[PDB]
Design a protein around this ligand. Structure first.
Ligand SMILES: CCCCCCCCCCCCCCCCCC(=O)OC[C@H](COP(=O)([O-])OCC(O)COP(=O)([O-])OC[C@@H](COC(=O)CCCCCCCCCCCCCCCCC)OC(=O)CCCCCCCCCCCCCCCCC)OC(=O)CCCCCCCCCCCCCCCCC
Ligand SMILES: CCCCCCCCCCCCCCCCCC(=O)OC[C@H](COP(=O)([O-])OCC(O)COP(=O)([O-])OC[C@@H](COC(=O)CCCCCCCCCCCCCCCCC)OC(=O)CCCCCCCCCCCCCCCCC)OC(=O)CCCCCCCCCCCCCCCCC
Ligand SMILES: CCCCCCCCCCCCCCCCCC(=O)OC[C@H](COP(=O)(O)OCCN)OC(=O)CCCCCCCCCCCCCCCCC
Ligand SMILES: CCCCCCCCCCCCCCCCCC(=O)OC[C@H](COP(=O)(O)OCCN)OC(=O)CCCCCCCCCCCCCCCCC
Ligand SMILES: CCCCCCCCCCCCCCCCCC(=O)OC[C@H](COP(=O)(O)OCCN)OC(=O)CCCCCCCCCCCCCCCCC
Ligand SMILES: CCCCCCCCCCCCCCCCCC(=O)OC[C@H](COP(=O)(O)OCCN)OC(=O)CCCCCCCCCCCCCCCCC
Ligand SMILES: CCCCCCCCCCCCCCCCCC(=O)OC[C@H](COP(=O)(O)OCCN)OC(=O)CCCCCCCCCCCCCCCCC
Ligand SMILES: CCCCCCCCCCCCO[C@@H]1O[C@H](CO)[C@@H](O[C@H]2O[C@H](CO)[C@@H](O)[C@H](O)[C@H]2O)[C@H](O)[C@H]1O
Ligand SMILES: CCCCCCCCCCCCO[C@@H]1O[C@H](CO)[C@@H](O[C@H]2O[C@H](CO)[C@@H](O)[C@H](O)[C@H]2O)[C@H](O)[C@H]1O
Ligand SMILES: CCCCCCCCCCCCO[C@@H]1O[C@H](CO)[C@@H](O[C@H]2O[C@H](CO)[C@@H](O)[C@H](O)[C@H]2O)[C@H](O)[C@H]1O
Ligand SMILES: CCCCCCCCCCCCO[C@@H]1O[C@H](CO)[C@@H](O[C@H]2O[C@H](CO)[C@@H](O)[C@H](O)[C@H]2O)[C@H](O)[C@H]1O
Ligand SMILES: N=C(N)NC(=N)NCCc1ccc(I)c(Cl)c1
Lengths: 174, 98, 57, 95, 83, 69, 96, 347, 307, 100
C-alpha cells in the first residue's frame, strides 16, 4: 500500500547500500550509490523536504557523483568487471540482502521488530504532524535563514570552500 | 523508534562495514565513505523535518557541502596515488610499514 | 498518568459555515471588518489558554 | 564551549541553532516546543548532576514528544486487539 | 590621477570583459548605501503579514493600540500605497 | 523559394501547440470548467481539503455558495 | 519597470495575506472541533475494543503533564480508512 | 609552497581548531574538524614523494572515518534530546560513537596504527603539528563530554595506549616513529585521569606539548631523523646533546624535571578516588618509555659514536635554522617542577 | 485522464523533433543557396518518416558492459522527456513549487548518459572523447545555474508559472539582456551545438543512434522553450489560454530556428577556447551580475513577493 | 501520484523504444589509469567546488524576504566575492590553462 511508501523506499535504500558496500567494480558501485541517492531523495521528499530532496539530486548526484564517475573512468576503472563474478562480493551481497529481507519480513508480520533496538512497524505516517495551514514552506524559511541568522555559518563555510580550491591545487601540482 | 529509522541506521552500518572491510580499489572505499554521508543526510533531514526544527533545516545542506569538499580532497589523493603506481590499489600504500 | 478529558460529541455540535473557499475569500475583507470582535476574542482565548477544549464557547 | 569566547564578547556565533525553542523565522514553533521549554526551565542553573534526578519528569515527557514511543506502543496495542476481535467477528467498526 | 586614467584606458583596451565585471561588482557593493530607496525594502518586507496578528488583552492603558482594524491607531500602509 | 520552408515549420508548430492546448482543456474538463486549483503551500491545501468536505460529493472543485447558508 | 511591477505585486500579496488573516479565526474554530470530535470518536471505540484487556485504562495519557498536547497523525486517524489517512498524510506532498 | 599560502594554510589549521574550542553547537564542532583536516593535508604532501602521499592518504581515511562516526553520534544525540548543545550526550550509543571517533582522531590504541606511519612519512615540521596542535581539538571535546563517557571504555583505551605506546617504541630506530609511539603512550595518561579530574588532563596535555615541541625542534635544527644521524650531534653541536639529554629524561618522568609533574599529579588524583591498582600499573608500564628514552641518551650524549671524515666540513658553518622558542621551551621542559602549584591556573 | 495528458505531451514532442530535422535541413539549405529535402513528400514533408523507418530497420551494429550500453540511451531519452512535465504552456502538466530547481536537478543528470556510453564504448579513445564532452557540459552548467538564480531574484520564487506573472508588463530580456546573452550561448554549449559541437567535430578529426538523436533534439527544443519563458514571457489570459499557447509557440520556434541560423554562420571553437570563453569570460561577468542582481531589488525597493 | 506516473511513463517508454530498436526482423539465415590528464581532473573538481557554492546561493530569492536585509545583503555579496576570489586564484596559478 501507498501508506508504506516511505518504508518501501527505505528498504530499497538499504539494498542499494548493500550493492556498493559489497564493493563490486567501482563502475557498478557508483551505480548503486546513484540509485540509493535517488531513493534517499524520495524518502526526504515524503517528509516535506522538497528543497532538501532536490539538493541531493542537484549536488550529490549531479555534482559529487558525476565527479566520482568522471574520476573512476579516468584513474580507476575503464572497463567494469562482470558484476558479482567475484566470490566475496557475491557472498557479501547475498549476506546483506538476506539480512534486509529477514528484517522486512518480521516488521511487516508483527508490525514491530527488535533488531538490537526496538522499532515500531505501524508505518511512518503515524508520527506525522496533524496541523499545517501556513502560507509558506517551513523548510524554505529555515534554509533562507542562513543569510540572517547564520552569518557565522556562512563565513566558515565560504572560507572552507576557498581553502578547498587552494588545497587541491597544492595537492595536485606535485 | 519509527520504522524508517531502522533501515536508515542499517544503511549507515552497511556502509561503515563496507568502509572498514577494504578490497583493492581505493575508489571503492571512497564510495562507502560517501554512502555513509548519504545515510547521515537522510537521517538528519528526517529528524529535522519531522520535529519541525525550522532553523536546523539548513544543517543537512551544510553537511552536504562540507562532505562534498572532503570527497573532493579524497579524490585528489586517489589520483596522486594512481599517478604513482598506475592503479588505485591500496596494497601499494605499504611503504610506511618500514 | 491520568485521563485526557474530552468534551462530549454534543458539546462540539454547532451550525457550520458550509460555503467554499472562494466564497470565504470573496467575503474575507468585509468579514474581517464586521466580525472582528468575536473573532479576536476567540483568538485571544486560543493563544492564552493554549488548549482547544477551553475556547469552545 | 572549551573557551567561552561567545559569552565573553556577547557575540552569538552558534547559540541561535542549539535548541528548537529558540527564536525561529516567522515564529514557526517546533512540535515539542512546550516540552523543551519546560525541561530547559526546570533544569536551568542547577547543573546536570541535579537536573538528571530532579527534572526527570519534564525530560521523560520531552523524550516522549520527540520519539513518541509510548504513544506508538499504545496505538499498537489498540490496533492489535481490534484485529483480534474482528478476526473473531465480535466487533464491527462504525462509519 | 593621470596614472589612474592611463591604467584604466589600458585595461579597457586589453580586457574590457574584466573591466566590466569589476565595475558591475563595485556598483553592487556601493550603490545600496547611496540609494534613497534602500530603506523601503526593509519596510515593505516587515509590512508583509505572514502569521496571525495575535490580539492583546486590553488592560485599559493602551491608547496607542487599535480596538478595531479600521480604527486609526496602529501602523499605516499609506506610504506603501503611494509607492 | 524560402517560403517552402514554412510547411515543415507549420507541422513543427502544430506539434508544439498540442501539449499546451491539451493540458488546458483537460484541466477544465476535470475541474468543472475552471482552472485547476493551485496548492503550493499548506494553507491552500487546507482550503482545498475543506472544499472537498463542503462540496458534499468529495470534489474540491464543486463550489457551494449562499444557497448552502 | 520591474521596480514598479514588483511593488504592486507586494501590495497584492499583502491584500491576499490579509484575506487569510480575516478567515483564520473561523478556520481555527473549525479545526479545534474537528480534532476534538475525532479524538472523542477514537475514545468510544477504545472503550469497546479494550473493555476486557486487564489493567487497561481507557483514554489514559502517556504524558506526565496534564497540559493539552497536540495529537499526532496516528492518534487522530489511527482507526480510520486508509484512503482518508493517505490523503491526510501525503495528499499535500503528492499534489501535482 | 608559496610563503603566503603556507601562512594561510597554517592559519586555517589553527582556525579549525579554534572553532572546535569556542563552539557550543555540535555542527560547528564537526565543521572545525573538517576545516582543520582539509588544511593539514597540504603540509603532509608538501615534499611530494610516494611516502608523503601514502601518509596523507592513510591520514585522510582515518580522519574522514572518525568524522563520519562523530556526525552519527551528533545525529543520534539530536534524535534523543532535540538539541545540538556541546555538552554531555543524551544517549549511551552516541557516547560510545563519539568516544571512539575521538579516540581514532587522537590515535589512541587500538586505533593507533596510523600515527607511526603518518608521522614517519611527513616532514619533521608537519609531524610537529600532527603530534601537538592536532591533539588540542579532540581533547577539548573530551573535556566537555566526559560526564557521559563510559568509564570502562575510556580507561580501557588509556591502558591499551600506555602498553602499546610503551612496547611499540622499544623496536624503533626512526626518530619520528619513536615520537609517534611516545605520543600514543602519553595520550593514555591524559585520558586515564579525565574521568576523575579534567584539569590534570589539561596539565598533562600542555606539558606534553612543550616537551614534544622541544624534541621536534632539536631534531629539526640538525635535520636528524634516525638514531644514527642523531648520534653525530656530539661532533657538531655538543650543547644540543645536553639539551636532548635533559629533555628526554624529562619525558621519562624523572624527578626533579618537569615531566615528573603530570605523572605525579595524575597518580594523586587517582589515589584520591581509591584507584590504586591502575595508577601503579600505569607508572610501572611507563618504565618502557624511559627505557627507549635512555637508549637515545646513550647514543647521543653519554657516549661518543663514530664519526665521518666529511663531518669536518660542517665545523666551519653555523646553525642557520630558526629554532624558534627553543631556549624557552627547553627550560620549561626541564625546570618547571618547583612551580607545580601553578597548575591551578588551569582550573 | 492524466495518462491521456502525459501522452498528449510525449507524442507531440517526438513528432516535433522528427520535423525539426526537416526544418533544420531546409533552413540550412536556403542559407546555403540550395533547397534541402524537397523530393520525399511535398516540400520534403515525408523525409523525417523515411529517415525514421530507415534507421530502425538498419542493422543494429562488442560493448564493454551490456547494462550500461542500454542504460545510457534510456537515461538520455527518459530524462529529456521529463524536463517537459513542469513547463507552463501556460498550465504545466505537473505544477511544481520548485519547478526551476527540478529542471536544474534533472538537467544535471543528463551528463551520465555521456559518461555511461563512453564507458560502454569499450574503446580507450571513445572514453576520452566522452570525458572531454562531460568537462564541457559541467563547465557551462555553472553559468546556467548562476544566471538562472540572478533572474529569479526578480521573479521571487522557483515556480515556473511565476515567471509569467513577473513578465506581465514587460519581458525580462529588457532588465536582463546581458544575462540573456550569456544564457543563450550557454544553452548552445550545453547542448553541444555549433559553434560548440566539438563531439562531432573532434570525432571526425540504427535505432540506438536514433534514440540519442531524439534526446538531443528534444533538449534543444526544450531549452529554447525555457529561454522563451525565462526572458520573453508571454501574457496569459485565463479565459483564452490558447492565445498564450500560440504566442509562446512562435517565440520558441523562432528561438529554435536561431539555433540553426547560428550553426550556418560561424566556424567551430577549439576545445581550449570554449573553456576560456566560460571560465575567463562568462563566469567573471556572471558572478559580477549575480552580485548586481542581488543588490538591485534591495536598492530600488523592487523585491518581488515570496508567493 | 501524478509525478510518479509521469516519470514511470517517460522512462518506461524510453525502455520500450530501446527494446524494439535492438530487436527487429533481420531476414538472414546465416582498470589502469586512462592516459591520465591532470587538467581534466581539475576541471571536474573545480566544477564540484563551484557547484557547492551555488548550492549555498540558491536560497537567495527567499533570503531577500527577510527584515534583516543589512545582514543578508552583506553575506550574499561576501559569498559571491569569495567565489570570485577562488576563480582569481585558479586563474593566476595557471589553473585555467590548457597548454603543457
Ligand atoms: C548489520 C551489519 C552489516 C551487515 C553487512 C551485510 C552485508 C552487506 C555488505 C557489507 C559490506 C561487506 C564488505 C565485505 C568486503 O568487501 O570485504 C572483502 C574482504 C577482502 O576482500 P578481498 O580482497 O577480495 O579478499 C577476500 C578474502 O579476504 C581473501 O583475501 P586474502 O588474500 O587475505 O586470503 C587469505 C584469507 C584467509 O582467510 C582466513 O584465514 C580466515 C579464517 C578465519 C577462521 C576463523 O584472508 C582473509 O580471509 C581475510 C579475513 C580474515 C578474517 C578476519 C577476522 C574477522 O573479503 C572478506 O573478508 C569477505 C567477508 C564478507 C562477509 C561480510 C560479513 C559482514 C558482517 C560484518 C560484521 C557485522 C556483524 C553484526
Ligand atoms: C610563569 C611560568 C614560567 C615562565 C613563563 C614564561 C613564558 C615565556 C615568556 C616569553 C619569552 C619570550 C622570549 C623573550 C624574548 C627573548 C628574545 C629577545 O630578546 O628578542 C629581542 C628581539 C630580537 O632579538 P633577536 O636578536 O632577534 O634574538 C631572538 C632570540 O634569539 C629569541 O628569538 P625566538 O626565535 O626564540 O623568538 C622569541 C620571540 C620573538 O622574538 C622577538 O621579537 C622578541 C619578542 C618577545 C616578546 C616578549 C613578550 C613578553 C611579555 C608578554 C606580554 O617570541 C615572541 O614573540 C614571544 C611570544 O628584539 C625585539 O624586537 C623586542 C620585541 C619588540 C616587540
Ligand atoms: C533520474 C530519474 C528521475 C528521478 C526523478 C526525481 C524526482 C524528484 C521529484 C521532486 C520534485 C518535487 O519537489 O515535487 C514533486 C512532489 C512534491 O511537489 P512540490 O510542488 O515540490 O511540493 C508539494 C506540493 N507543493 O513530490 C512527490 O511527488 C513525491 C515523490 C516521491 C517519490 C520519488 C522517488 C524517486 C526515486 C528515483 C530513484
Ligand atoms: C608552546 C609550544 C610552542 C611551539 C613553538 C614551536 C615553533 C616551531 C619550531 C621552531 C623551529 C623553527 C621553525 O620554523 O619551525 C619549523 C616549522 C616550519 O617548518 P619549516 O620546515 O622550518 O619551513 C616551513 C616552510 N614550509 O614551524 C612550524 O611550522 C610551526 C609548527 C609548530 C606549531 C605547533 C606548536 C605546538 C602547539 C602550540 C600551542 C601551545 C599550547
Ligand atoms: C633549578 C630547579 C630545576 C631543577 C631541574 C634540573 C634542571 C637541570 C637541567 C637544566 C636544563 C639543561 C641545561 C644544561 C646546560 C648545558 C650547558 C653545559 O653545561 O655545557 C655543555 C657543553 C658545552 O660544550 P660546547 O658547546 O662545545 O662549549 C664548550 C666548548 N668546549 O657541552 C659538552 O661539553 C658536552 C659534554 C658531554 C655531555 C655530558 C652530559 C653530562 C652533564 C649533564 C648536564 C646537564 C644535566 C642533564 C640532566 C638534567
Ligand atoms: C540579433 C539576432 C540574435 C538571434 C536570436 C534569436 C532571436 C529570436 C527571438 C524570437 C522572439 C521574437 C518575438 C516574436 C513575437 C511573436 C508574436 C508575439 O508574441 O507578439 C506578442 C508581443 C507582445 O505580447 P507579449 O509577448 O505577451 O508581451 C507581454 C508581456 N507578457 O508582441 C511583441 O512583439
Ligand atoms: C565600463 C568600463 C569603463 C572604463 C572605466 C571603468 C573604471 C572602473 C572599473 C575598474 C576595474 C579595473 C579592474 C581591471 C583589472 C584587470 C586586470 C587584468 O588586466 O588582468 C588580466 C590578466 C589575465 O590575462 P591573461 O590572458 O592571463 O594574460 C594576458 C596574455 N595575453 O590578469 C589576470 O590574471 C586576470 C585577473 C584575475 C582574474 C580575476 C577575475 C575577476 C573575478 C571574477 C568576478 C569579477 C569581479 C567580482 C564579481
Ligand atoms: C558501532 C555501530 C555503528 C552503527 C550505529 C547504528 C545506529 C545506532 C542507533 C542507536 C539508537 C538507539 O539507542 C538506544 O535506543 C533505545 C530505545 O529506548 C534506548 O532505550 C533502551 O535502553 C534504555 C535503558 O535505560 C531504556 O530506554 C530502555 O531500557 C531501552 O529501550 C537506549 O538507551 C539507546 O541506547
Ligand atoms: C576566522 C574568521 C574571523 C572573522 C570573524 C567574524 C565574526 C562575525 C560574527 C557575526 C555574528 C555577530 O553577532 C551576531 O550578529 C547578528 C547580526 O549581524 C545578530 O543576529 C541578529 O539577526 C538574526 C535574525 O534574527 C538573529 O541572529 C538575531 O535575531 C539577531 O541578533 C546577533 O544578535 C549577533 O550576536
Ligand atoms: C519505425 C517502424 C518501421 C516498421 C517497418 C517494418 C518492416 C519490417 C521488415 C524489415 C526488413 C529488414 O530487411 C533487412 O534488414 C536487415 C538489417 O540488419 C538487413 O541486414 C541483415 O541481413 C544481412 C544479410 O542480408 C546480414 O548480414 C545482417 O547481419 C542482417 O542485419 C537485411 O539486409 C535486410 O534485408
Ligand atoms: C571579501 C569580503 C567582502 C564583503 C563584502 C560586503 C559588502 C557589503 C556592502 C553593503 C552592505 C550594506 O548595504 C546596505 O547599506 C545601507 C546603508 O545605508 C543599509 O541601510 C539601508 O537599509 C536599511 C534597512 O536595513 C535602512 O534602515 C536604511 O535606512 C537604509 O539606508 C542597507 O540595509 C544595506 O543593505
Ligand atoms: N541533422 C539533420 N537535421 N539532419 C539529419 N540527417 N538528421 C538525422 C536524421 C534523423 C534522425 C532521427 C530521426 I527519429 C529522424 Cl526523423 C531523422
Amino acid at each position: 500500500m501507498m501508506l508504506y511508501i516511505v518504508f518501501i523506499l527505505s528498504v530499497i535504500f538499504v539494498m542499494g547500500f548493500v550493492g556498493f558496500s559489497s564493493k563490486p567494480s567501482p563502475i557498478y558501485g557508483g551505480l548503486g550509490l546513484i540509485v540509493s541517492g535517488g531513493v534517499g531523495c524520495g524518502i526526504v521528499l515524503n517528509f516535506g523536504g522538497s528543497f532538501l530532496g532536490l539538493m541531493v539530486f542537484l549536488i550529490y548526484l549531479g555534482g559529487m557523483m558525476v565527479v566520482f564517475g568522471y574520476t573512476t573512468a579516468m584513474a580507476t576503472e575503464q572497463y567494469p568487471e562482470i558484476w558479482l563474478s567475484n566470490k566475496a562480493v557475491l557472498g557479501a551481497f547475498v549476506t546483506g540482502l538476506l539480512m534486509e529481507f529477514f528484517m522486512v519480513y518480521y516488521v511487516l508480520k508483527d508490525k514491530e521488530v527488535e533488531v538490537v533496538f526496538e522499532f515500531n512497524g505501524l508505518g511512518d505516517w503515524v508520527i506525522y504532524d496533524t496541523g499545517d495551514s501556513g502560507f509558506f514552506s517551513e523548510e524554505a524559511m529555515g534554509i533562507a535563514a542562513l543569510y540572517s541568522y547564520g552569518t557565522w555559518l556562512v563565513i566558515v563555510t565560504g572560507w572552507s570552500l576557498l581553502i578547498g580550491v587552494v588545497v587541491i591545487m597544492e595537492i595536485t601540482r606535485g | 523508534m519509527s520504522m524508517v529509522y531502522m533501515n536508515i541506521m542499517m544503511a549507515f552500518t552497511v556502509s561503515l562495514v563496507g568502509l572498514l572491510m577494504y578490497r583493492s580499489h581505493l575508489m571503492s572505499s571512497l564510495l562507502c565513505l560517501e554512502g555513509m554521508m548519504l545515510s547521515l543526510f537522510v537521517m538528519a533531514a528526517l529528524t529535522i523535518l519531522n520535529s519541525h526544527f525550522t532553523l536546523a533545516s539548513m544543517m543537512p545542506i551544510i553537511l552536504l557541502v562540507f562532505a562534498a569538499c572532503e570527497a573532493a580532497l579524497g579524490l585528489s589523493l586517489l589520483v596522486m596515488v594512481s599517478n604513482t603506481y598506475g592503479t588505485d590499489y591500496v596494497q601499494n600504500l605499504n611503504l610506511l610499514q618500514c | 498518568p491520568g485521563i485526557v478529558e474530552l468534551p462530549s460529541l454534543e458539546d462540539l455540535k454547532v451550525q457550520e459555515v458550509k460555503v467554499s473557499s472562494s466564497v470565504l475569500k470573496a467575503a474575507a475583507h468585509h468579514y474581517g471588518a464586521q466580525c472582528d470582535k468575536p473573532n479576536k476574542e476567540f483568538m485571544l482565548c486560543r493563544w492564552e489558554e493554549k488548549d482547544p477544549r477551553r475556547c469552545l464557547e | 564551549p572549551f573557551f567561552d569566547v561567545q559569552k565573553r564578547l556577547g557575540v552569538d556565533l552558534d547559540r541561535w541553532m542549539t535548541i528548537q525553542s529558540a527564536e525561529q523565522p516567522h515564529k514557526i514553533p517546533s512540535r515539542c516546543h512546550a516540552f523543551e521549554k519546560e525541561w530547559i526551565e526546570c533544569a536551568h542553573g542547577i547543573g546536570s548532576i541535579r537536573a538528571e534526578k530532579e527534572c526527570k519528569i519534564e525530560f521523560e515527557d520531552f523524550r516522549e514528544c520527540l520519539l513518541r514511543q509510548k504513544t506508538m506502543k499504545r496505538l499498537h496495542a489498540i490496533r492489535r486487539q481490534r484485529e483480534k476481535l474482528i478476526k473473531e467477528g465480535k466487533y464491527t467498526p462504525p462509519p | 590621477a593621470e596614472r589612474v586614467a592611463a591604467f584604466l584606458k589600458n585595461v579597457w583596451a586589453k580586457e574590457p570583459v574584466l573591466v566590466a565585471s569589476f565595475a558591475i561588482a563595485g556598483l553592487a557593493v556601493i550603490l545600496p548605501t547611496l540609494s534613497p530607496y534602500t530603506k523601503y525594502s526593509l519596510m515593505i518586507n516587515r509590512a508583509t503579514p505572514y502569521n496571525y496578528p495575535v490580539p492583546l488583552r486590553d488592560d485599559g492603558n493602551m491608547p496607542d493600540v487599535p480596538s478595531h482594524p479600521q480604527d486609526p491607531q496602529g501602523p499605516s500602509l499609506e506610504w506603501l500605497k503611494r509607492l | 523559394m524560402w517560403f517552402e520552408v514554412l510547411p515543415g515549420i507549420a507541422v513543427m508548430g502544430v506539434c508544439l501547440f498540442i501539449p499546451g492546448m491539451a493540458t488546458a482543456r483537460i484541466h477544465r474538463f476535470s475541474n468543472g470548467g475552471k482552472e485547476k486549483r493551485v496548492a503550493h503551500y499548506p494553507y491552500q491545501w487546507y482550503l482545498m481539503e475543506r472544499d472537498r468536505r463542503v462540496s458534499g460529493v468529495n470534489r474540491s472543485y464543486v463550489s457551494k455558495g449562499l444557497e448552502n447558508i | 519597470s520591474m521596480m514598479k511591477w514588483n511593488r504592486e505585486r507586494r501590495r497584492l500579496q499583502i491584500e491576499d495575506f490579509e484575506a487569510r488573516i480575516a478567515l483564520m479565526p473561523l478556520l481555527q474554530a473549525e479545526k479545534d472541533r474537528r480534532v476534538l470530535q475525532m479524538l472523542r470518536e477514537n475514545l468510544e471505540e477504545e472503550a469497546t475494543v479494550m473493555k476486557d484487556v486487564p489493567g487497561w485504562k481507557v483514554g489514559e495519557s502517556v504524558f506526565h503533564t496534564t497540559r493539552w498536547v497536540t495529537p499526532m497523525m496516528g492518534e487522530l486517524y489511527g482507526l480510520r480508512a486508509s484512503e482518508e489517512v493517505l490523503s491526510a498524510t501525503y495528499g499535500f506532498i503528492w499534489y501535482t | 609552497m608559496n610563503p603566503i599560502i603556507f601562512i594561510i594554510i597554517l592559519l586555517t589549521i589553527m582556525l579549525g581548531t579554534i572553532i572546535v574550542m569556542i563552539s557550543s553547537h555540535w555542527l560547528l564542532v564537526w565543521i572545525g574538524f573538517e576545516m582543520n583536516m582539509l588544511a593539514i593535508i597540504p603540509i603532509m604532501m608538501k615534499n611530494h614523494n610516494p611516502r608523503a602521499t601514502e601518509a596523507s592518504t592513510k591520514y585522510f581515511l582515518t580522519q574522514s572515518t572518525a568524522s563520519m562516526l562523530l556526525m552519527m553520534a551528533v545525529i543520534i544525540n539530536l534524535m534523543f534530546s532535540g538539541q545540538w548543545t556541546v555538552m554531555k550526550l543524551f544517549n549511551p550509543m552516541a557516547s560510545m560513537l563519539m568516544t571512539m571517533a575521538l579516540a581514532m582522531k587522537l590515535g589512541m590504541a587500538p586505533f593507533h596504527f596510523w600515527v607511526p606511519e603518518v608521522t614517519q612519512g611527513i616532514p619533521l615540521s608537519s609531524g610537529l603539528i600532527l603530534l601537538t596542535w592536532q591533539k588540542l581539538a579532540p581533547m577539548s571535546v573530551l573535556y566537555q563530554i566526559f560526564p557521559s563517557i563510559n568509564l570502562n571504555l575510556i580507561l580501557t583505551l588509556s591502558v591499551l595506549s600506555i602498553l602499546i605506546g610503551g612496547w611499540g617504541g622499544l623496536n624503533q630506530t626512526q626518530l619520528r616513529k619513536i615520537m609517534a609511539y611516545s605520543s600514543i603512550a602519553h595520550m593514555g595518561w591524559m585520558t586515564a585521569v579525565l574521568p576523575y579530574n579534567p584539569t590534570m588532563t589539561l596539565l598533562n596535555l600542555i606539558i606534553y606539548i612543550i616537551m614534544t615541541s622541544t624534541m621536534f625542534t632539536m631534531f629539526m635544527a640538525n635535520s636528524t631523523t634516525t638514531t644514527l644521524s642523531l648520534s653525530h650531534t656530539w661532533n657538531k653541536t655538543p650543547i644540543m646533546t645536553v639539551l636532548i639529554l635533559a629533555t628526554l629524561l624529562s619525558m621519562g618522568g624523572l624527578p626533579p624535571l618537569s615531566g615528573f609533574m603530570p605523572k605525579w599529579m595524575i597518580i594523586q588524583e587517582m589515589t584520591k578516588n581509591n584507584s590504586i591498582i591502575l595508577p601503579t600499573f600505569m607508572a610501572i608500564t611507563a618504565l618502557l618509555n624511559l627505557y627507549f628514552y635512555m637508549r637515545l641518551t646513550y647514543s647521543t650524549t653519554l657516549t661518543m659514536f663514530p664519526s665521518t671524515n666529511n663531518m669536518k666540513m660542517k665545523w666551519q658553518f653555523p646553525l642557520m635554522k630558526k629554532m624558534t622558542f627553543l631556549p624557552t621551551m627547553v627550560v620549561l621542559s626541564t625546570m618547571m617542577l618547583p612551580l607545580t602549584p601553578m597548575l591551578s591556573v588551569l582550573e | 485522464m492524466f495518462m491521456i495528458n502525459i501522452l498528449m505531451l510525449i507524442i507531440p514532442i517526438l513528432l516535433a523533433v522528427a520535423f525539426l530535422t526537416l526544418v533544420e535541413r531546409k533552413v540550412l539549405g536556403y542559407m546555403q543557396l540550395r533547397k534541402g529535402p524537397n523530393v520525399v513528400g511535398p516540400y520534403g514533408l515525408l523525409q523525417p518518416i523515411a529517415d525514421a523507418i530507415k534507421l530502425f530497420i538498419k542493422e543494429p551494429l562488442a560493448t564493454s558492459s551490456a547494462s550500461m550500453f542500454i542504460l545510457a540511451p534510456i537515461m538520455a531519452l527518459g530524462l529529456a522527456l521529463t524536463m517537459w512535465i513542469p513547463l507552463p504552456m501556460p498550465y504545466p502538466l505537473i505544477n511544481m513549487n520548485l519547478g526551476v530547481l527540478f529542471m536544474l536537478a534533472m538537467s544535471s543528470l543528463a551528463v551520465y548518459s555521456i559518461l555511461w556510453s563512453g564507458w560502454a564504448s569499450n574503446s580507450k579513445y571513445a572514453l576520452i572523447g566522452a570525458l572531454r564532452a562531460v568537462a564541457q557540459t559541467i563547465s557551462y552548467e555553472v553559468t546556467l545555474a548562476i544566471i538562472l538564480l540572478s533572474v529569479l531574484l526578480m521573479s521571487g520564487s522557483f515556480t515556473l508559472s511565476t515567471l509569467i506573472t513577473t513578465q506581465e508588463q514587460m519581458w525580462l530580456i529588457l532588465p536582463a539582456w546581458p544575462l540573456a546573452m550569456m544564457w543563450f550561448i550557454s544553452t548552445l554549449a550545453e547542448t553541444n551545438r555549433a559553434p560548440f559541437d566539438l563531439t562531432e567535430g573532434e570525432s571526425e578529426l540504427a535505432g540506438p543512434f536514433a534514440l540519442f538523436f531524439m534526446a538531443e533534439y528534444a533538449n534543444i527544443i526544450m531549452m529554447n522553450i525555457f529561454t522563451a519563458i525565462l526572458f520573453l514571457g508571454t501574457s496569459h489570459n485565463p479565459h483564452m489560454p490558447e492565445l498564450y499557447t500560440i504566442n509562446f509557440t512562435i517565440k520558441s520556434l523562432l528561438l529554435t530556428m536561431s539555433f540553426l541560423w547560428i550553426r550556418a554562420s560561424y566556424p567551430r571553437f577549439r576545445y581550449d577556447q570554449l573553456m576560456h570563453l566560460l571560465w575567463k569570460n562568462f563566469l567573471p561577468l556572471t558572478l559580477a551580475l549575480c552580485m548586481w542582481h542581488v543588490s538591485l531589488p534591495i536598492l530600488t525597493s523592487g523585491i518581488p513577493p515570496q508567493t | 501520484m501524478n509525478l510518479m506516473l509521469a516519470l514511470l511513463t517517460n522512462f518506461t517508454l524510453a525502455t520500450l523504444l530501446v527494446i524494439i530498436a535492438f530487436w527487429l526482423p533481420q531476414l538472414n539465415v546465416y582498470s589502469a589509469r586512462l592516459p591520465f590528464s591532470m587538467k581534466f581532473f581539475l576541471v571536474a573538481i573545480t566544477f564540484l567546488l563551484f557547484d557547492l557554492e551555488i548550492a549555498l546561493l540558491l536560497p537567495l530569492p527567499w533570503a531577500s524576504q527577510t527584515a534583516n536585509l543589512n545582514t543578508m545583503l552583506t553575506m550574499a555579496l561576501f559569498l559571491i566575492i569569495l567565489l570570485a576570489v577562488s576563480l582569481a586564484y585558479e586563474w593566476t596559478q595557471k589553473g585555467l590553462e590548457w597548454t603543457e
